[PDB]
Design a protein around this ligand. Structure first.
Ligand SMILES: Clc1ccc(OCc2nn[n-]n2)cc1Cl
Ligand SMILES: [Zn+2]
Length: 258
């Protein structure tokens, strides 16, 4: 499969290999803040990352990815709309060529510079590959990035990117604390959706924080120096690796806050 983000292989083409692209619960979506309703039934959100064990950072040709040890319940997400325990496996970002675009979710049609996704899987399914085959298999926590002041808890990530410039490169990435990437507030929107790249599986409970984090222009500029290509191939800058908003169809987006 040779999907990507270019003109010839980008999101508008994906449905030919992955017909679920035109399904009933595709992601991302636009979050209309005036239609989302506060839901007093949502339990408090519990982000438990004290014992998180980061391993490695990988450029996979689509994004860069920070992987965690998920062989035990070390870093988990619980509460909110979720039943049971979801284990952190990895995080990654989507970003733009310019500061005015890059996020996948939008808020009243506003695009942010980037979007962070912390990916967790439902431990009742035993492994990640089983979980993605279930409608409640994954919980993705999404965090918008706006350009402003630097985010000190991002700089360890930015500083390692020149060591994984091209597809297939990886580096050791131990002792990284993903709590440094969270905003002050865990107020969120939630809805049922999908992965935002092939295979586009409809397996995700989306939890999107309302409060963006601020990163500096210099930090996001370094994201944009990565490459979609492998070493020794013509350079194609890793920018605009985001899927645009998909039809909401017969879904409601719920707010955790009044
Ligand atoms: Cl492990 C993993 C890595 C990246 C990825 O990128 C697409 C995406 N982002 N949010 N949902 N889908 C999806 C997964 Cl599951
Ligand atoms: Zn993502």
């Amino acid at each position: 499969h040779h999907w990507g983000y270019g003109k010839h292989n980008g999101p508008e083409h994906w449905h030919k290999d992955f017909p679920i692209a035109k399904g009933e619960r595709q992601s991302p979506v636009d979050i209309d803040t005036h239609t989302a309703k506060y839901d007093p039934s949502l339990k408090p959100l519990s982000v438990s990352y004290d014992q998180a064990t980061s391993l490695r950072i990988l450029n996979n040709g689509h994004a860069f990815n920070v992987e965690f040890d998920d062989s035990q319940d070390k870093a988990v997400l619980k509460g909110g709309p979720l039943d049971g325990t979801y284990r952190l496996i990895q995080f990654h970002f989507h970003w733009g060529s310019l500061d005015g675009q890059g996020s996948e979710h939008t808020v009243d049609k506003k695009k942010y510079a980037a979007e962070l996704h912390l990916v967790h899987w439902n431990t009742k399914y035993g492994d990640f590959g089983k979980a993605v085959q279930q409608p409640d298999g994954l919980a993705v926590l999404g965090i918008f990035l706006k350009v402003g002041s630097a985010k000190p808890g991002l700089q360890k990530v930015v500083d390692v990117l020149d060591s994984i410039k091209t597809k297939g490169k990886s580096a050791d990435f131990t002792n990284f604390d993903p709590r440094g990437l969270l905003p002050e507030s865990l107020d969120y929107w939630t809805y049922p959706g999908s992965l935002t790249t092939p295979p586009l599986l409809e397996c995700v409970t989306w939890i999107v924080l309302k409060e963006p984090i601020s990163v500096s222009s210099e930090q996001v500029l370094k994201f944009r120096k990565l490459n979609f290509n492998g070493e020794g191939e013509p350079e194609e800058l890793m920018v605009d690796n985001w899927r645009p908003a998909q039809p909401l169809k017969n879904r409601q987006i719920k707010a955790s806050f009044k």
